[PDB]
């Protein structure tokens, strides 16, 4: 489709930032929510559930954790929180607060301890969800942030937008339709505006071992402003959670006991 | 340790409408884990700033005509122009982006091998205003010629001069591929007024015999 | 979309070079912004680069003396180079994102400011006519200025066809000289004014000279 083709062309012409702004602008012509509701999707033995927040990339969703759920079999059951609006018909959230509310609702209405997990921008959604859960009285035992680049610490990702955008078209596992592409615009604006709050929750940073592009020093790595443990897995920003899902599972096991 | 980029050839004359290729070889690999090569090509046309032609080894910047294309990976790379045109005269640099500092090749100059054109010659006496200064500049102009090789000789009262002239040569024009040249004979006023006939003699490939322009006083 | 560059072109040794680049047309926040230099007759040396947050990458050969600053408020970034010597004489360019991906729509480099290091003070040029004799050539002789560069146009830019402005020559005196010539129809030498306009920013001087028979 036209949006998908424009996204591709945005990547090769160095104009992703302004195309993301166009997608955000379009997304303001879909309907939004701020009594809407959603449901987790079950993906096994274990005492503490690993709950996964879908990413916010155009190809994102529950399916992107299939390989880590499999690698976590025998360690923890795995449930997945979808990001509302990536499926046709779903409204978009008016804010980070609006999506954490309905997501927090669905976790509390179906749990029994748990940790919350997310990849890339998914990590930021996961930490917002855990923030909202700790505020409501049902706090997870911790958060696992997989290649998180919080706002203000994304110089590497911005300098690699062409590499990442072409890599997303290689690994297009669900096809980026219009509903997905505008949702990408709308969530990208929300997470850009959002700022994590200190919570005191135990935090595990799972960083990639390999950069997605050239860089002069180590400062390309994920970062987190509050106290946390850090572990590295083989792979780049994309492969760390797919072809190397087992390396992450083992670190999650160790961190859980 | 910094990447060293070696360009070859350092000087490349091509008849127009022929193709041409420039090679560059880095001392470390410009290939990155992710598969891309971070090698740029820039063209500095006469009198202008470098401008990007080829980025990421093989991609053409906006506005770059399709006769330009690059190729290579890892340690060697080449730039190729298929149908070289007059507008393409200038100096081509490659630059590597995989490492810091960024480093450039020495640059290779591309000259358009056009047909032979003899120079038009003009001689200019110093102005009376300049003579009030104690100095005379006598100027000999060779206009729109090819090839660049040209000998300009000053002769004052038929004494050949030496060591008191300096030349300046334009760069190859971007429309008609010629050069132009000025030679300046600098004398004190006293020495200027001590002689009568001032001549410059021009020997060029396009002149069957040397050409002399001259004036008196 | 466009870069403008300004700063002082002559400075005494041991002093501090200072240059500024202004970016017009947005897109300031997505790229690192570079400074490059090119000594006379030689190639290109990458100096360093800065992004909007002020993060900085430097060339190790210059890191001790180089400072690059950014003012996001004006979309301007600046270069300072301290304890300067004759090996710092060069043309200095500003540019976007050298060597990164994303450069299909890269802006042209700044037009480059020539910086000369010397203890000799500035001198504006003397301009003498190269009178047409008896298709005709005429010109202007721009004599004894320091430092480079002078620019020349004819009839305020309205005359470009046939114009040849030669590279300046450095003379034994330490001063520069160049000539600008143009060929015109020999029939026009009565019916057309020819004025050469010489600009020498380093001495804050502009000269217009009418050339006639
Ligand atoms: Cl275009």
Q: Where are the domains of chain B?
A: 1-113, 114-217
- Interface subset of B 30-89, CB within 8 angstroms of C: 36, 38, 40, 49-52, 55-56, 59, 61-62
- Interface chains of chain B (3 or more CB pairs under 8 Å): A, C
Q: CA A39 to CA C151: how far, in whole Å?
A: 72
Active site residue A94: no
Max intra-chain CA distance, chain B: 75
- Distances from the Cα of C19 to the Cα of C82, C103, C113, angstroms: 12, 24, 8
Q: CA A158 to CA C102: how far, in whole Å?
A: 10
What are residue B8's DSSP bridge partners?
B23
Look at A213 and B34 and tell me if their CB atoms are within 8 Å. Answer: yes
Look up the CATH architecture of domain B1-113: Sandwich (2.60)
Q: For residue A108, which of A142, A75, A135 has the smallest C-alpha distance?
A: A135
A14 at C interface, C-beta within 8 A = yes
- Which position among A27, A60, A120, A207 bears the catalytic label? A120
Residues of B in contact with A212 (CB under 8 A): 34
Please tell me the CATH code under which domain C120-213 is placed. Answer: 2.60.40.10
Question: How far does the centroid of ligand 1 lie from the alpha carbon of residue C46, in Å?
Answer: 28
3-state secondary structure of C67: strand
Q: CA C145 to CA C203: how far, in whole Å?
A: 9
Give one DSSP letter per residue of C123-187, joined into a string: BPPEEEEE-----EEEEEEEEEEBSS--EEEEGGGTB-TTEEEPPPEE-TTS-EEEEEEEEE-GG
Q: For residue C99, which of A164, B95, B58 has the smallest C-alpha distance?
A: B95
Q: Which residue of B has its CA nearest to A216?
A: B100
Active site residue A153: no
Q: CA A214 to CA B189: how far, in whole Å?
A: 64
- Interface subset of C 3-32, CB within 8 angstroms of B: none
| A97-127: b (≥16 Cβ within 10 Å) or e | ebbbbbbbebbeeeeeebbbbbbbbbbbbbb
CA angle B138, B47, C153 (to 5 degrees): 55
Backbone angles phi, psi at C184, to 5 degrees: -135, 165
Of A12, A212, A216, the CB nearest to B100: A216
Determine whether C207 is exposed, middle or buried from the number of CB atoms within 10 Å of its CB (0-12, 13-18, 19+). Answer: middle
Assess whether the previous peptide bond of B147 is cis (omega < 30° from 0).
yes
Name the residue with tokens 């590497």: A156
Contacts of A27 (CB under 8 A, 6+ apart): A92, A182, A183, A185, A186
Method of structure determination: X-ray
3-state secondary structure of A22: helix
What tokens does C148 get?
A: 């480079």
Contacts of C206 (CB under 8 A, 6+ apart): C197, C198, C199, C200
Sign of the dihedral defined by the CA atoms of residues B99, B102, B103, B108, in that order: positive
Q: CA B164 to CA A192: how far, in whole Å?
A: 69
Q: For residue B42, which of B76, B4, B92, B77 has the smallest C-alpha distance?
A: B92
Determine whether A76 is exposed, middle or buried from the number of CB atoms within 10 Å of its CB (0-12, 13-18, 19+). Answer: buried
Contacts of B190 (CB under 8 A, 6+ apart): none
Q: For residue C142, which of C211, C91, C190 has the smallest C-alpha distance?
A: C211
What tokens does A14 get?
A: 């160095």
Rounded to the nearest angstrom, the minimum Cα separation between A22 and chain C is: 15
Q: For residue A201, which of A142, A247, A157 has the smallest C-alpha distance?
A: A142
What tokens does A236 get?
A: 């780049």
Q: CA B134 to CA A104: how far, in whole Å?
A: 93
Contacts of B179 (CB under 8 A, 6+ apart): B144, B145, B146, B148, B169, B170, B171, B172, B173
Name the residue with tokens 């005269």: B89
- Is there a contact between C51 and C32 (Cβ–Cβ < 8 Å)? yes
3-state secondary structure of A127: helix
Residues of chain C with CATH 2.60.40.10: 120-213
Rounded to the nearest angstrom, the minimum Cα separation between B194 and chain C is: 22
- Cα A177 to chain centroid distance, Å, stands at 19
Q: CA A110 to CA A40: how far, in whole Å?
A: 8
- Is there a contact between C164 and C147 (Cβ–Cβ < 8 Å)? no
Of C98, C104, C179, the CB nearest to B102: C98
Give the homologous superfamily in CATH for domain B114-217.
Immunoglobulins (2.60.40.10)
3-state secondary structure of A179: helix
3-state secondary structure of A234: coil
What 8-state DSSP symbol labels residue C105?
T
If phi over 0 gives left and psi between -120 and 50 gives alpha, with beta otherwise, what is residue A160? alpha
Q: Where are the domains of chain A?
A: 1-257
A105 is in an annotated binding site: no
Q: CA C126 to CA B39: how far, in whole Å?
A: 46
- Is there a contact between A218 and A123 (Cβ–Cβ < 8 Å)? no
Domain A1-257 has CATH 3.40.50.1820: yes
What tokens does A248 get?
A: 């992450």
Give one DSSP letter per residue of chain B, joined into a string: ----EEEE-SEEEE-TTS-EEEEEEESS--B-TTS-B-EEEEEE-TTS--EEEEETTTEEPTT--TTEEEEEETTEEEEEESS--GGG-EEEEEEE-SSSS-EE---EEEEE----BPPEEEEEPPPHHHHTTTEEEEEEEEEEEBSS-EEEEEEETTEEP-SSEEEEEPPPPTTT--EEEEEEEEEEHHHHTT--EEEEEEEETT-SS-EEEEEE-
Q: For residue A38, which of A92, A118, A76, A117 has the smallest C-alpha distance?
A: A92
A188 is in an annotated binding site: no
A56 is in an annotated binding site: yes
**Pairing label, strands A114-119, A143-146:** parallel
Rounded to the nearest angstrom, the minimum Cα separation between C108 and chain B is: 6
3-state secondary structure of A224: coil
SS3 for A23-84, per residue?
HHHHHCCCCEECCCCCCCEECCCCCCEEEEECCCCCCCCHHHHHHHHHHHCCCCCEEEECCC
What 8-state DSSP symbol labels residue C83?
S
């Amino acid at each position: 489709s036209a949006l998908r083709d424009g996204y591709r062309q945005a990547g090769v012409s160095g104009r992703v930032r302004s195309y993301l702004d166009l997608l955000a602008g379009l997304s303001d012509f879909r309907e939004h929510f701020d009594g809407f509701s959603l449901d987790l999707v079950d993906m096994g033995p274990g005492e503490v559930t690993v709950i996964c927040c879908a990413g916010t990339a155009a190809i994102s969703g529950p399916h992107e954790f299939t390989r880590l759920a499999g690698a976590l079999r025998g360690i923890a059951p795995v449930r997945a929180v979808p990001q509302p609006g990536y499926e046709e018909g779903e409204p978009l959230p008016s804010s980070m607060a609006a999506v954490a509310a309905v997501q927090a609702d669905a976790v509390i209405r179906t749990q029994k301890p748990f940790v919350v997990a997310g990849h890339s921008a998914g990590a930021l959604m996961a930490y917002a969800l855990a923030t909202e859960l700790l505020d409501r009285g049902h706090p997870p035992r911790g958060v696992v942030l997989i290649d998180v680049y919080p706002p203000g610490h994304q110089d590497a990702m911005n300098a690699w937008l062409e590499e990442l955008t072409a890599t997303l078209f290689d690994r297009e596992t669900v096809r980026m339709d219009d509903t997905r592409l505008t949702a990408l615009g709308a969530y990208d604006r929300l997470t850009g505006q959002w700022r994590p709050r200190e919570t005191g929750l135990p935090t595990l940073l799972v960083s990639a071992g390999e950069p997605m592009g050239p860089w002069p020093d180590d400062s390309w790595k994920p970062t987190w402003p509050f106290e946390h443990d850090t572990v590295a897995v083989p792979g780049d920003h994309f492969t760390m959670v797919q072809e190397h899902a087992d390396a992450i599972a083992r670190h999650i096991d160790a961190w859980l006991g | 340790l910094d990447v060293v980029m070696t360009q070859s050839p350092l000087s490349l004359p091509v008849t127009p409408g022929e193709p041409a290729s420039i090679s560059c070889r880095s001392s470390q690999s410009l290939l990155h884990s992710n598969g891309y090569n971070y090698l740029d090509w820039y063209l500095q046309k006469p009198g202008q700033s470098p401008q990007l032609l080829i980025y990421l080894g093989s991609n053409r910047a906006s506005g770059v005509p399709d006769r330009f294309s690059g190729s290579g990976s890892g340690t060697d790379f080449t730039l190729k122009i298929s149908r070289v045109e007059a507008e393409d005269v200038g100096v081509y640099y490659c630059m590597q982006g995989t490492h810091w500092p960024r480093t450039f090749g020495q640059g290779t100059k591309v000259e358009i091998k056009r047909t032979v054109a003899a120079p038009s010659v003009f001689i200019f006496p110093p102005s009376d205003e300049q003579l009030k200064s104690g100095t005379a500049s006598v100027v000999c102009l060779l206009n729109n010629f090819y090839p660049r090789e040209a000998k300009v000789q000053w002769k004052v009262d038929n004494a050949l001069q030496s060591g008191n002239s300096q030349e300046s040569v334009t760069e190859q024009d971007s429309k008609d591929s010629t050069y132009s040249l000025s030679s300046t004979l600098t004398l004190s006023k006293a020495d200027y007024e001590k002689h009568k006939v001032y001549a410059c003699e021009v020997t060029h490939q396009g002149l069957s015999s040397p050409v002399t322009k001259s004036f008196n006083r | 979309v466009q870069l403008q560059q300004w700063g002082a072109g002559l400075l005494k040794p041991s002093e501090t070079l200072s240059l500024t680049c202004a970016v017009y047309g947005g897109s300031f926040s997505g790229y690192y912004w570079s400074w490059i230099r090119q000594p006379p007759g030689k190639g290109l040396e990458w100096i360093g680069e800065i992004n909007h947050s002020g993060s900085t990458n430097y060339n190790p050969s210059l890191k001790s003396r180089v400072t690059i600053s950014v003012d996001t408020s004006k979309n301007q970034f600046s270069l300072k180079l301290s304890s300067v010597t004759a090996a710092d004489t060069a043309v200095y360019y500003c540019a976007r994102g050298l060597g990164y991906s994303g450069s299909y729509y890269a802006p042209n480099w700044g037009q480059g400011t020539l910086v000369t290091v010397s203890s000799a003070s500035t001198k504006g040029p003397s301009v003498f006519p190269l009178a047409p004799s008896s298709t005709a050539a005429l010109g202007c002789l721009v004599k004894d200025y320091f430092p480079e560069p002078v620019t020349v146009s004819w009839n305020s830019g309205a005359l470009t066809s046939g114009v040849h402005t030669f590279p300046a020559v450095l003379q034994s005196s330490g001063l520069y000289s160049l000539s600008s010539v143009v060929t015109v129809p020999s029939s026009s030498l009565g019916t057309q004014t020819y004025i050469c306009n010489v600009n020498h920013k380093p001495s804050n001087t502009k000269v217009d000279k009418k050339v006639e028979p």
